[PDB]
């Protein structure tokens, strides 16, 4: 897992102007890239994600290729995590999965557990800690947890 800064934990599409610049500085220092000028790539995430490798190489001819590849690795990891959330919580939309990941700082395990607890919380009509405790006892089997709750409506 790419050790992105918590400041840049958000998905690239959600990056702001200041965020993209933070990613450039984090990238040039973490991977010893050639110094990249903030004046270049002065844009938000949506624009950065619309730059081809040629475009990248236009802004920075000595680091554009590496920066483009790093953006691809980040994007592939995001899509993998979203898929992981979807495999464990059937019915979650692509948007609900990325929202749940945003709410746990990109931690897939935590996002899955939050989504499962949110489903059970409505049945339990009790505390979040109560829903969380029940689910964890049943090893996050929502159907087993639900049956336990349903016997004690
Ligand atoms: K791009
Ligand atoms: K219990
Ligand atoms: K009860």
Curated annotation (Swiss-Prot):
<comment type="similarity">
    <text>Belongs to the protein kinase superfamily. Tyr protein kinase family.</text>
</comment>
<comment type="subunit">
    <text>Interacts with the SH3 domain of PLCG1 via its Pro-rich domain.</text>
</comment>
<comment type="function">
    <text>Involved in negative regulation of cell growth. Has tumor suppressor properties. Plays a negative regulatory role in the Ras-MAPK pathway. May function in signaling pathways utilized broadly during fetal development and more selectively in adult tissues and in cells of the lymphohematopoietic system. Could specifically be involved in phospholipid signal transduction.</text>
</comment>
<protein>
    <recommendedName>
        <fullName>Non-receptor tyrosine-protein kinase TNK1</fullName>
    </recommendedName>
</protein>
